[PDB]
Amino acid sequence: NNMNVIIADDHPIVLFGIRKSLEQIEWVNVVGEFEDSTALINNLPKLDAHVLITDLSMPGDKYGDGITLIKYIKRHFPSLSIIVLTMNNNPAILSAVLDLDIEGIVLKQGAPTDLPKALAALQKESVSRLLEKRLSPKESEVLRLFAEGFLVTEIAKKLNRSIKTISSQKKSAMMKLGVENDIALLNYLSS
Amino acid sequence: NNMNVIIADDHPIVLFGIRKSLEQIEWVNVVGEFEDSTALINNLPKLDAHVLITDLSMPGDKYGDGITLIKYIKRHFPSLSIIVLTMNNNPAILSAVLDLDIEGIVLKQGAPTDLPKALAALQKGKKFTPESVSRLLEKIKRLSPKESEVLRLFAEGFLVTEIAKKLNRSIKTISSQKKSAMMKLGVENDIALLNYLSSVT
DNA sequence: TTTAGGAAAAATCTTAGA
DNA sequence: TCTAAGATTTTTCCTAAA
């Protein structure tokens, strides 16, 4: 009858806000908060949970974060619903996230009531749907890691991939966003 | 004995978390939440308040955000304490914030009890910068004229080689003068550098 | 403090197979 | 679209003069 949820974000203030937002609902059961992927994966089999609420930017090294994490959780925990909630407002990155066949996407902006609305929709969003009506997944991941401060070689090391590949993906992404240098790049990703 | 606070953050979920975290304290009175600076300044004189808990990034075009906002609030409302809670861990940005005389700074990470500690520190008329802030400021100081010129041209959008040709010195000289400046500002790579210089224009 | 030189690294520019 | 191995450009690293 009940439903168990797991929240995952590196901001403990966000964890507290989400947990207090879910205590408004009595059929929701918070079975654990997590701040990194390494502990999350190690505690997933121990908790028979139903829904996972997570962010893309997460400090992990063994299982990573972002798309690479989702593809993992979709492959090793198929009986798990995933609702990602993100803080950034990049239409390309967001798009690449929506194209992962997940059970909901929640922006942090304009979402005081629609997160319980999506949670109740899993029993069967609004602002993100209104904004719903372009970069590839790999380009979006490279730009997300680059925005957080990771260098090209650092991103290549974090993904077990070649530096030349990450350089080509980033540079092509800049050519597709009409951006000529790194300053305007971070200026765009921040906007 | 009481104390009025105003919360300002563009994340409504973070706003909700801060509101519920301040509900834990009964001598704190949340007199208003705001998600942009334009609505914050227009309602600042209407509410007599004591403390303003704010973030750096704010979607306000008329009054700005970050440093530009603080400089305004310190100049127009001097009888107001400012607690800046932020998400980023840039030592140079945080340092530039502390050099504006704020009543406390709190990282959003690892502060479930730190913000009430700072609020209680404002009772004795003291500031409170927790251990995380001190560790962030440990990596940081006066800058030289050459370093300021190189950081200028690199700030506009000039490459290292471009600056080397404009100043008619070598590439390695400009590289050294830039990397030393980043070593003195506590910045570790180029992304945090451009974040800093974009925050302090 | 400012200025570089050789060595090394980091990042890009081609060109190209899946 | 994703991936990457050359040549090539760009930047840094150690080191060291004044």
Residue numbers in the entry:
A (entry chain B): 2 to 125, 131 to 139, 150 to 207
B (entry chain A): 2 to 141, 149 to 209
Copy the relevant paper text.
At its core are three multidomain proteins, two hybrid histidine kinases (RcsC and RcsD) and a response regulator (RcsB).
The asymmetric unit of the RcsB crystal in complex with DNA22 contained one RcsB dimer bound to one double helix DNA, whereas the RcsB crystal in complex with DNA18 contained an RcsB tetramer (two RcsB dimers) bound to two parallel double helical DNAs. Superposition of dimers in the two structures shows that the average RMSD value was 1.15 Å. Interestingly, within the RcsB tetramer of the RcsB-DNA18 complex, dimers formed asymmetric interfaces between their REC domains. We cannot exclude the existence of a higher-MM RcsB-DNA complex, as indicated by the slowest-migrating band. This putative complex could correspond to an RcsB tetramer bound to two DNAs as seen in our RcsB-DNA18 cocrystal structure. The RcsB-DNA interactions were largely identical at all sites in the structure of RcsB in complex with either DNA22 or DNA18. The structural similarity between RcsB dimers bound to DNA observed in two different crystal forms suggests that this dimer is likely biologically relevant.
